[PDB]
Design a protein around this ligand. Structure first.
Ligand SMILES: *[C@@H]1O[C@H](CO)[C@@H](O[C@@H]2O[C@H](CO)[C@@H](O[C@@H]3O[C@H](CO[C@H]4O[C@H](CO[C@H]5O[C@H](CO)[C@@H](O)[C@H](O)[C@@H]5O)[C@@H](O)[C@H](O[C@H]5O[C@H](CO)[C@@H](O)[C@H](O)[C@@H]5O)[C@@H]4O)[C@@H](O)[C@H](O[C@H]4O[C@H](CO)[C@@H](O)[C@H](O)[C@@H]4O)[C@@H]3O)[C@H](O)[C@H]2NC(C)=O)[C@H](O)[C@H]1NC(C)=O
Ligand SMILES: *[C@@H]1O[C@H](CO)[C@@H](O[C@@H]2O[C@H](CO)[C@@H](O[C@@H]3O[C@H](CO[C@H]4O[C@H](CO)[C@@H](O)[C@H](O)[C@@H]4O)[C@@H](O)[C@H](O[C@H]4O[C@H](CO)[C@@H](O)[C@H](O)[C@@H]4O)[C@@H]3O)[C@H](O)[C@H]2NC(C)=O)[C@H](O)[C@H]1NC(C)=O
Ligand SMILES: *[C@@H]1O[C@H](CO)[C@@H](O[C@@H]2O[C@H](CO)[C@@H](O[C@@H]3O[C@H](CO[C@H]4O[C@H](CO)[C@@H](O)[C@H](O)[C@@H]4O)[C@@H](O)[C@H](O[C@H]4O[C@H](CO)[C@@H](O)[C@H](O)[C@@H]4O)[C@@H]3O)[C@H](O)[C@H]2NC(C)=O)[C@H](O)[C@H]1NC(C)=O
Ligand SMILES: *[C@@H]1O[C@H](CO)[C@@H](O[C@@H]2O[C@H](CO)[C@@H](O[C@@H]3O[C@H](CO[C@H]4O[C@H](CO)[C@@H](O)[C@H](O)[C@@H]4O)[C@@H](O)[C@H](O[C@H]4O[C@H](CO)[C@@H](O)[C@H](O)[C@@H]4O)[C@@H]3O)[C@H](O)[C@H]2NC(C)=O)[C@H](O)[C@H]1NC(C)=O
Ligand SMILES: *[C@@H]1O[C@H](CO)[C@@H](O[C@@H]2O[C@H](CO)[C@@H](O[C@@H]3O[C@H](CO[C@H]4O[C@H](CO)[C@@H](O)[C@H](O)[C@@H]4O)[C@@H](O)[C@H](O[C@H]4O[C@H](CO)[C@@H](O)[C@H](O)[C@@H]4O)[C@@H]3O)[C@H](O)[C@H]2NC(C)=O)[C@H](O)[C@H]1NC(C)=O
Ligand SMILES: *[C@@H]1O[C@H](CO)[C@@H](O[C@@H]2O[C@H](CO)[C@@H](O[C@@H]3O[C@H](CO[C@H]4O[C@H](CO)[C@@H](O)[C@H](O)[C@@H]4O)[C@@H](O)[C@H](O)[C@@H]3O)[C@H](O)[C@H]2NC(C)=O)[C@H](O)[C@H]1NC(C)=O
Ligand SMILES: *[C@@H]1O[C@H](CO)[C@@H](O[C@@H]2O[C@H](CO)[C@@H](O[C@@H]3O[C@H](CO[C@H]4O[C@H](CO)[C@@H](O)[C@H](O)[C@@H]4O)[C@@H](O)[C@H](O)[C@@H]3O)[C@H](O)[C@H]2NC(C)=O)[C@H](O)[C@H]1NC(C)=O
Ligand SMILES: *[C@@H]1O[C@H](CO)[C@@H](O[C@@H]2O[C@H](CO)[C@@H](O[C@@H]3O[C@H](CO[C@H]4O[C@H](CO)[C@@H](O)[C@H](O)[C@@H]4O)[C@@H](O)[C@H](O)[C@@H]3O)[C@H](O)[C@H]2NC(C)=O)[C@H](O)[C@H]1NC(C)=O
Ligand SMILES: *[C@@H]1O[C@H](CO)[C@@H](O[C@@H]2O[C@H](CO)[C@@H](O[C@@H]3O[C@H](CO)[C@@H](O)[C@H](O)[C@@H]3O)[C@H](O)[C@H]2NC(C)=O)[C@H](O)[C@H]1NC(C)=O
Ligand SMILES: *[C@@H]1O[C@H](CO)[C@@H](O[C@@H]2O[C@H](CO)[C@@H](O[C@@H]3O[C@H](CO)[C@@H](O)[C@H](O)[C@@H]3O)[C@H](O)[C@H]2NC(C)=O)[C@H](O)[C@H]1NC(C)=O
Ligand SMILES: *[C@@H]1O[C@H](CO)[C@@H](O[C@@H]2O[C@H](CO)[C@@H](O[C@@H]3O[C@H](CO)[C@@H](O)[C@H](O)[C@@H]3O)[C@H](O)[C@H]2NC(C)=O)[C@H](O)[C@H]1NC(C)=O
Ligand SMILES: *[C@@H]1O[C@H](CO)[C@@H](O[C@@H]2O[C@H](CO)[C@@H](O)[C@H](O)[C@H]2NC(C)=O)[C@H](O)[C@H]1NC(C)=O
Ligand code: NAG
Lengths: 168, 129, 112, 130, 427, 53
């Protein structure tokens, strides 16, 4: 049961810098990351950025230079900085928590990586060799890696969002 | 006579009358001619047997029962350990499921035993005029 | 980069509709597309993740599928509460870098 | 443990009927299995017992020549429980044999009341009629 | 009605435990050196009323035996002559088998000698005729001492005092599960460490019906162990009458080359009575169908795992099993199987070193009981249409599981606490 | 902080059955020798406390 609370300014002057905060209370994570997505009126969602539990940060490549994300574990918050605010940046800014996980290429259970088999006999889809063959290569034991996506990502919780208007 | 562990499936009392067979056949002594991997093994196993035996004898002595086998204590049976009466325990369960049922509270019983024996010995020290 | 979606779609009560999401190998092709429903007013609600896995509380009539670089959201037994902007999304080479689609608006005609 | 007996059978007088008693939740080989009946006219009546372990049987004199008690070999489940099955076949049925029949697990593995029926099944209703 | 705890020492209580076991023999460097001779009479004590869970696949006796055989293999190979200098460039001509002449260091450092030896095709590979031994670019090589014998003799695995071995005496006992009839022993029966692939040799036979044991039948990845109730007989001969030529290659070192062949140009083989093998195969498919049918060969590249590999008289045989596994079942004339021979083997070249099996002079012939099999399913097709079984011998541990299936190791916990109406005498 | 900036390369040359010597390949990158930095402020504080004791 994760709770997200956004806080920050409601009004920016043109070219001012926008600093927002998202306070997560009631964490119930499992790796995952916390970040920010935006939506300008009448436009599509545009992913902005995130920070994960290991301290690695990532930003929307087309906007990184205007963005900055920090964290504070003691206050259990994260921040967002957006420089050079224009009318383009007037938008709803959603704080989110997302499930992030990179799956390396892994052999199915009861199989072990054995490159000797394809190297010397030329078989296809035989990167993994049945453990029942004790390091020996058997064509009857061949198998590809676990069929699954290399990259796993989806938004698991959405904050209520904060509207930011740029105006004189 | 049934032999080593022969009464494993018997009632706890039937096995209790012949605990001495299992207790005696617990220590071996299988000579040697190692004069090697096999030698390292045989030497290592040698130690562990009498090691467990001496740990058990240590426990027996620190409970006032260095004479082994059957002894009684001053510790009352707290009903929270098991709620079964005497007939059920001694004529319905074997020692295996018994130790399974009481393994939750074994160490507490051991502590109660050691402390009751220590208090008995302090009383013995007090016991002269 | 933005995943290609039709500007809008519509359908009458008691029918099926589908929304396409065109990307590339580096996002949709990775095979982990997610779908999100934004009803004007309420906060966004996660609906599908991992191409086919339904979020908690999402009925069966919301189905996610994918062929290659095109993901599809199928909605059967249309109800008035479905009218909304729908966005697909996917990781892009990075499991932290995410890309969204242009969005498709669903309108439901024939209401009481 | 649970004792599950066969359901119910209708048999004509002079015929025979076989009631089953499948066991679980305890070591079937250890406790005796008794067969006891209840009729409205004569009340409760103990019929006999059988040992699943040894095959030893003890039948009441009134049923020694028309009742056959058998057991299967215990089917192990874990180590302290098993499933088993005992059968009782009663023949030459009469109207006064109509009633409820029970199989029952014994009380203790040793003692002064080993066979004493302790855990009872749900019963099998036998009706003798034309 | 007042209960007090009382201590009992020597209660029949045991717990599952993994400990360092030790060997036993009496009648060969691996087991004749062994350890302590077995007792004249072993005590197998039946435990009435006792039902204990066994698991042959999570058994530690298997891993212990595996590492013990490995370490013994290394300890017996270490003092023998390593043929590192035999990697000279070889000039080879045809007699399969090839006559190879090469230089070799003599005893005096400055002098060299040109000698010739016979080498099987598997041992040598060409580079640019000029040849080299196949191992010389992968690993070093050492020659098994001629005195030590590769004949497996029974080795009894024993538990230390305070521990015990539980033996399931249930005839129909599955690989894993509760055993209603259990006896306890200090040491197992005489287990011959027969190194084999595919079919099992010299094992113990299951009573009543033959036994099919897997870790998971429906899982193709887990192998299938087969134990016969009736042993089949297999006669294996190497008809070539080889000769051993001891050529001195230094002070003390001596290489055992293969001299010219005497006799026929026939390759080693094994016969198996077709009648008995048809009966055994029928009973096999009956026990296979108890959980569900054709049989095909396995084709996986490594000759030593694709073929019934074993050792006989000191020569290492690798056998085409195609005559045994070409069948389809929907419910003397002895079959003959061709066997090739290798003298260079690498079952652990990476862990350690390779072994050169010295040539055996004369004709070779050994008779073996074939007690078991090791099988594997294909990849899952359209379900329940057809099932195909190919033989494998992927690992050596499955042989240890094949003979350790009935045994289990436990430690005695002789400390029981129980309530009686007894209190000690008041001070 | 200690660094060896040279980007060395390892060349495995086989010198017998099994034996393999790991030679140093040609350098990639700078011609700089390994070094270690130590913060002068912290080392001046530590040296002061050292001479006091
Ligand atoms: C493994 O587990 C099994 C199962 O749990 C366990 O077997 C139980 O063992 C306990 C004790 O060890 C038994 O409890 C005792 O039972 C004794 C035997 O009962 C007698 O009565 C039977 C009925 O006799 C009538 O019918 C016959 C005709 O059938 C007739 O001739 C008679 O006159 C009489 O009318 C009788 O059939 C039975 O015979 C069997 O056993 C004898 C050997 O005793 C054998 O010769 C026969 O061939 C037949 O197999 C037997 O004669 C009983 O004597 C005993 O009561 C006395 O002892 C207790 C102390 O134990 C005293 O407190 C008591 O006051 C009496 O003096 C007691 O009731 C239990 O019945 C077994 N069966 C169960 C529980 O199902 C094994 O022991 C376990 N073994 C191990 C190694 O763990
Ligand atoms: C012994 O060997 C058999 C070989 O068939 C194994 O049986 C198969 O086991 C696998 C998993 O090990 C099963 O595949 C998985 O099924 C999950 C659903 O299971 C339920 O539904 C099935 C179908 O109705 C029931 O039969 C079953 O009893 C369950 O009630 C899926 O959710 C799984 O998908 C997820 O995991 C995989 C990775 O494993 C991912 O790739 C997916 O994306 C997803 O995240 C998976 O598909 C298979 O169904 C079993 N076969 C059959 C015929 O049922 C036994 O498991 C094995 N025994 C042991 C102890 O391992
Ligand atoms: C595995 O399978 C192989 C073949 O695949 C077997 O090899 C055969 O072994 C037998 C021995 O049992 C050999 O038999 C020998 O046959 C000689 C010729 O007999 C042929 O001619 C007569 C008349 O024409 C035919 O009736 C007969 O059927 C044969 O076709 C005999 O002369 C030999 O007898 C020897 O002993 C007597 C008495 O001691 C002497 O007086 C003789 O002079 C002679 O020395 C002998 O019986 C047969 O030749 C082998 N075949 C091949 C191809 O080599 C293996 O035996 C079998 N089992 C294993 C390997 O364990
Ligand atoms: C499965 O189990 C069986 C049964 O144990 C094994 O069969 C044994 O096979 C081995 C070969 O590896 C046999 O050992 C050899 O036997 C030859 C024939 O023996 C005859 O001659 C002797 C002369 O003393 C007679 O006593 C005997 O009764 C026979 O008539 C011998 O020529 C061999 O001697 C050479 O090796 C020994 C040991 O290294 C040296 O001491 C000698 O000096 C000599 O160099 C050798 O004895 C053995 O006899 C077979 N046993 C039985 C009972 O038949 C299978 O091999 C086994 N399966 C596998 C795969 O190993
Ligand atoms: C031990 O001590 C040694 C020196 O004795 C240190 O080595 C230096 O390490 C730093 C890294 O912290 C190197 O700094 C690099 O400087 C580049 C050039 O900057 C110079 O020019 C500007 C403008 O003229 C000056 O203002 C500035 O002060 C410098 O004089 C930068 O371009 C580098 O930036 C990199 O990162 C950015 C962002 O990621 C990229 O966009 C850039 O393109 C570039 O890749 C970098 O900051 C410095 O060059 C090193 N000196 C030497 C002599 O090698 C060790 O760091 C120190 N600690 C150890 C070894 O642990
Ligand atoms: C150094 O040691 C290495 C040990 O890892 C040796 O590697 C193995 O050497 C053996 C023979 O010496 C090779 O076995 C051969 O493999 C070929 C492959 O066939 C395919 O490729 C050819 C040409 O590439 C193609 O024309 C065919 O159509 C096939 O598609 C087989 O054809 C041969 O019959 C034979 O089995 C191993 O393949 C090889 N393994 C590896 C991983 O390299 C190596 O040979 C040693 N060095 C030297 C110089 O001998
Ligand atoms: C593998 O080799 C085994 C030998 O090590 C083979 O077993 C042998 O098989 C032959 C048949 O091929 C048997 O010979 C039979 O002997 C019986 C009995 O002989 C006795 O009685 C006769 C009178 O009838 C008497 O004259 C003799 O002196 C004997 O006292 C004969 O009745 C048969 O006709 C036949 O000749 C061998 O007995 C048997 N060996 C043993 C030890 O029993 C085995 O077949 C081979 N397997 C394969 C697949 O090749
Ligand atoms: C040996 O190597 C060490 C690294 O392994 C060196 O330690 C590092 O020293 C640098 C300075 O040279 C520190 O950088 C500082 O970082 C702080 C804090 O950054 C955080 O806050 C800012 C906002 O102020 C935020 O934007 C960032 O994202 C961070 O969240 C800055 O305030 C400083 O100005 C300065 O940039 C490293 O932090 C420090 N490493 C660690 C792990 O702390 C060490 O100095 C080296 N020693 C020698 C003798 O060479
Ligand atoms: C493998 O090759 C070697 C040599 O390449 C063969 O050895 C050669 O065997 C022949 C006999 O077939 C020898 O010929 C005889 O040698 C004696 C020596 O005193 C001579 O007096 C005779 O007049 C006759 O020439 C030959 O010397 C010998 N060595 C060489 C270098 O040729 C060997 O036989 C081959 N092995 C096989 C199985 O073919
Ligand atoms: C198990 O049986 C398979 C067949 O299902 C065996 O593979 C086959 O072996 C035969 C040998 O009699 C091969 O025939 C020969 O192939 C060579 C290829 O160069 C060709 O030049 C010859 O003229 C002849 O036709 C056959 O090709 C081969 N097929 C396959 C698919 O492997 C296998 O060797 C047997 N293995 C065991 C361990 O029993
Ligand atoms: C250490 O010394 C060795 C030899 O003394 C150097 O190896 C030599 O490196 C040069 C490149 O700088 C090689 O030249 C090129 O060789 C290829 C070979 O196919 C040829 O096709 C090109 O046209 C070019 O000539 C040279 O072959 C190579 N070997 C020799 C014997 O000169 C090595 O680079 C030196 N290491 C350092 C760090 O300087
Ligand atoms: C070996 O035999 C045991 C029975 O002794 C099998 O255990 C049963 O496994 C099935 C799973 O298919 C369970 O549903 C049963 O409840 C198990 N029975 C018991 C008594 O535990 C075991 O599966 C068999 N092993 C193999 C590999 O076939
Ligand atoms: C008995 O056990 C209970 C629960 O473990 C504990 O609260 C109590 O103090 C124990 N001793 C008694 C009741 O004398």
């Amino acid at each position: 049961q994760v709770q997200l609370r956004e806080s920050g300014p409601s009004l920016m002057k043109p070219s001012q810098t926008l600093s927002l905060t998202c306070t997560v209370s009631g964490s119930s994570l499992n790796d995952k990351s916390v970040g920010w997505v935006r939506q300008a009126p009448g436009k599509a969602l545009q992913w902005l950025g995130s920070v994960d539990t290991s301290g690695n940060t990532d930003y929307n490549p087309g906007l990184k230079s205007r963005l900055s994300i920090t964290k504070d574990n003691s206050k259990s918050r994260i921040s967002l900085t957006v420089t050079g605010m224009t009318t383009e940046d007037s938008a709803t800014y959603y704080c989110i928590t997302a499930h992030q996980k990179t799956n390396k290429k892994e052999c199915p259970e009861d199989y072990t990586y054995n490159p000797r088999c394809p190297q010397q006999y030329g078989w296809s889809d035989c990167d993994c060799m049945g453990d029942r063959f004790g390091g020996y290569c058997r064509q009857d034991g061949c198998s590809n890696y676990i069929h699954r996506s290399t990259y796993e990502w989806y938004v698991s919780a959405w904050g209520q969002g904060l509207l930011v208007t740029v105006s004189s | 006579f049934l032999g080593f562990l022969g009464a494993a499936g018997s009632t706890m009392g039937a096995a209790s009358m012949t605990l001495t067979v299992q207790a005696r056949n617990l220590l071996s002594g299988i000579v040697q001619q190692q004069s090697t991997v096999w030698g390292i093994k045989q030497l290592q196993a040698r130690v562990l047997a009498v090691e467990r035996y001496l740990r058990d004898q240590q426990l027996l002595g620190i409970w006032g029962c260095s004479g082994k086998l059957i002894c009684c204590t001053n510790v009352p049976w707290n009903s929270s350990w098991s709620n079964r009466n005497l007939s059920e325990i001694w004529d319905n369960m074997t020692w295996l499921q018994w130790d399974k049922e009481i393994s939750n509270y074994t160490q507490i019983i051991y502590g109660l035993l050691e402390e009751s024996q220590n208090q008995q010995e302090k009383n013995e020290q007090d016991l002269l005029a | 980069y933005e995943l290609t979606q039709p500007s809008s779609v519509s359908g009458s009560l008691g029918q099926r509709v589908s929304v396409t999401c065109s990307g590339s190998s580096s996002n949709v092709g990775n095979g982990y597309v997610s779908w999100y429903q934004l009803i004007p007013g309420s906060a966004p609600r996660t609906i599908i993740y991992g191409d086919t896995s339904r979020a908690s509380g999402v009925p069966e009539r919301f189905s996610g599928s994918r062929s290659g670089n095109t993901a599809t959201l199928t909605i059967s037994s249309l109800q008035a509460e479905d009218e909304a902007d729908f966005f697909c999304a996917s990781p892009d080479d990075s499991s932290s870098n995410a890309v969204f689609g242009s969005g498709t608006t669903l309108t439901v005609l024939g209401q009481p | 443990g649970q004792l599950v007996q066969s359901g119910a059978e209708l048999k004509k007088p002079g015929a025979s009927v076989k009631i089953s008693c499948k066991t679980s939740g305890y070591r079937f080989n250890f406790y005796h299995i008794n067969w006891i009946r209840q009729t409205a006219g004569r009340g409760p009546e103990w019929m006999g017992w059988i040992s699943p372990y040894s095959g030893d049987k003890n039948l009441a004199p009134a049923f020694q020549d028309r009742v056959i008690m058998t057991t299967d070999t215990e089917v192990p489940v874990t180590s302290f429980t098993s499933t088993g099955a005992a059968y009782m076949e009663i023949r030459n049925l009469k109207f006064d044999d109509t009633g409820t029949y029970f199989c029952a697990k014994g009380l203790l593995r040793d003692g002064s009341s080993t066979w004493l029926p302790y855990l009872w099944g749900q019963g099998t209703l036998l009706t003798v009629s034309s | 009605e007042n209960l007090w705890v009382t201590v009992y020492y020597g209660v029949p209580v045991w717990k599952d435990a993994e400990t360092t076991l030790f060997c036993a023999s009496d009648a060969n460097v691996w087991a004749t050196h062994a350890c302590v001779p077995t007792d004249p009479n072993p005590q197998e004590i039946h435990l009435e009323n006792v039902t204990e869970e066994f698991n042959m696949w999570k058994n530690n006796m298997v891993e212990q035996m595996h590492t013990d055989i490995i370490s013994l293999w290394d300890q017996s190979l270490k003092p023998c002559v390593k043929l590192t200098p035999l990697c000279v460039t070889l000039q080879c001509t045809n007699v399969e088998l090839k006559n190879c002449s090469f230089n070799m260091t003599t005893e005096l450092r400055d002098k060299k000698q040109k000698v010739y030896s016979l080498f099987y095709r598997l041992d040598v590979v060409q580079i640019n005729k000029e040849y080299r031994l196949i191992n010389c670019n992968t690993s070093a090589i050492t020659q098994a001492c001629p005195k030590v014998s590769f004949e497996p003799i029974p080795i009894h695995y024993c538990a230390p005092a305070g521990f015990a071995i539980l033996k399931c005496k249930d005839k129909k006992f599955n690989g894993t599960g509760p055993c209603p009839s259990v006896s306890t022993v200090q040491c197992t029966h005489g287990i011959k460490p027969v190194v084999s692939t595919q079919l099992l040799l010299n094992g113990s036979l299951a009573e009543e019906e033959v036994m099919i044991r897997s870790e998971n039948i429906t899982n193709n990845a887990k192998n299938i162990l087969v134990q016969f109730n009736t042993p089949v007989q297999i006669n294996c001969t190497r008809p070539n009458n080889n000769t051993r030529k001891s050529i001195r290659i230094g002070p003390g070192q001596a290489f055992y080359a293969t001299g010219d062949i005497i006799g026929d140009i026939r390759q080693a083989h094994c016969n198996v009575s077709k009648a008995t093998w048809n009966e055994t195969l029928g009973k096999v498919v009956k026990q296979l169908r108890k959980h569900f049918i054709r049989f095909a060969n396995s084709s996986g590249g490594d000759l030593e795992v694709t073929t019934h590999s074993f050792n006989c008289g000191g020569e290492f045989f690798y056998c085409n099993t195609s005559g045994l596994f070409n069948s389809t079942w929907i419910s003397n004339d002895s079959i003959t199987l061709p066997c090739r021979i290798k003298q260079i083997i690498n079952m652990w070249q990476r862990i350690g070193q390779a072994m050169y099996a010295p040539p055996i002079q004369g004709v070779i012939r050994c008779v073996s009981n074939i007690t078991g099999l090791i099988l594997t399913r294909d990849g899952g097709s359209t379900n329940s249409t057809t099932e195909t079984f190919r033989p494998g011998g992927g690992d050596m541990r499955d042989n240890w599981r094949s003979e350790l299936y009935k045994y289990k190791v436990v430690k005695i916990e002789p400390l029981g606490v129980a309530p009686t109406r007894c209190k000690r005498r008041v001070v």
